[PDB]
């Protein structure tokens, strides 16, 4: 079925059950690894590196029901394990940080956006995951070229992955992607 590939498109796009090390360079993992690492500075000055280890997805605040009986979304928070390394001193600081909330499919094949049981569609051969997985790549693009802008206002000893990162650019990237979608 059309809806079968899609609930699978999305399925492996996420690898949300795969042990990160057993996760493959596909979709989200691809997006992450394409984006990361981010180097900046001349190595000597504030020579920096922000690198990706893995992402985790923390299960949704509510099951289908509650996201439904409320003008909100069936979402899971997504966090990623990052390391900041000073090329100067060799110190690594590893935080898990929150990047964005992330919408989930039903076995039916739909999302509960702001309560609305909306629907995205397979275009130009691209499937659900793919079309989305590239939107992921977008936010991350925007987020890099952030992180690396912060990288050059100094504060080396003060800096942390946490401080290089916020949730806005990825929030936006999926905000827009899902404001362009059908209503079942």
């Amino acid at each position: 079925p059309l809806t079968e590939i899609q609930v699978e498109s999305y399925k492996k796009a996420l690898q949300a059950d795969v042990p990160p090390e057993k996760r493959e360079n596909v979709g989200i993992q691809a997006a992450f690894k394409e984006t990361f690492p981010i180097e900046e500075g001349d190595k000597g000055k504030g020579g920096l590196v922000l690198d990706f280890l893995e992402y985790r997805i923390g299960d949704p605040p509510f099951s289908q029901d509650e996201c439904r009986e409320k003008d909100l979304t069936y979402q899971a928070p997504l966090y990623a394990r990052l390391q900041l390394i000073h090329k100067d001193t060799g110190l690594i600081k590893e935080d898990e940080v929150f990047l964005g909330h992330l919408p989930l499919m039903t076995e039916d094949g739909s999302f509960i956006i702001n309560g609305a049981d909306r629907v995205i569609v397979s275009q130009g051969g691209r499937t659900v995951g793919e079309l989305m997985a590239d939107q992921f790549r977008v936010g991350l693009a925007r987020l890099a070229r952030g992180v690396r802008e912060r990288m050059v206002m100094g504060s080396p000893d003060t800096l942390t992955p946490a401080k290089l990162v916020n949730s806005r650019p990825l929030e936006a990237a999926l905000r827009e992607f899902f404001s362009r979608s059908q209503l079942s």
Binding site: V49, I85, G90, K93, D157
Partner: protein, 158 residues
């Protein structure tokens, strides 16, 4: 120099505990690190063994370094810059370096002002942040809660 289970401090994330010695290859160069785990945090730090003081790592206060800290909060005085810009710079440094003794002595001075002459909010935030940090390292050292470590401080002032 440092051993697993050692309670430690690493500016800026503060107190932690040496997990063990980690071997990471990072950017094509494999090296040994001390691994530091942070409080209910999921955040870690990896410090090269070759020189860890060099990079800010230190032991935390022993339970017997603690009463001297409490005396600093109670009776501590230090000279501070005339002008607010330079003063905030000094305090900003003291807070960053993470020297508990220097921080306690600063905090003692700042609190003193808060009483006699009055403390600017800007400087007040330096005091709070100082308290915050000291309460966590004292809580760690005596294995009491942070709320409990603060309450200690509160009494040291009256």
């Amino acid at each position: 120099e440092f051993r697993p289970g050692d309670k430690v401090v690493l500016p800026p994330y503060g107190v932690g505990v040496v997990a063990g010695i980690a071997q990471r290859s990072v950017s094509g160069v494999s090296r040994a690190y001390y691994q530091v785990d942070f409080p209910g945090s999921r955040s870690k730090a990896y410090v090269p063994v070759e020189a860890p003081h060099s990079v800010g790592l230190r032991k935390a206060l022993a339970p017997e370094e603690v009463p001297v800290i409490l005396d600093l909060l109670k009776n501590g005085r230090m000279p501070l810059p005339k002008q607010w810009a330079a003063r905030h710079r000094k305090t900003s440094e003291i807070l960053a370096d993470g020297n508990p003794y220097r921080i306690a002595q600063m905090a003692g001075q700042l609190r003193a002002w808060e009483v006699e002459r009055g403390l600017p909010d800007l400087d007040r935030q330096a005091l709070r942040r100082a308290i915050h940090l000291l309460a966590e390292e004292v809580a760690q050292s005596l294995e009491i809660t942070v709320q409990e470590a603060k309450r200690l401080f509160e009494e040291a002032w009256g």
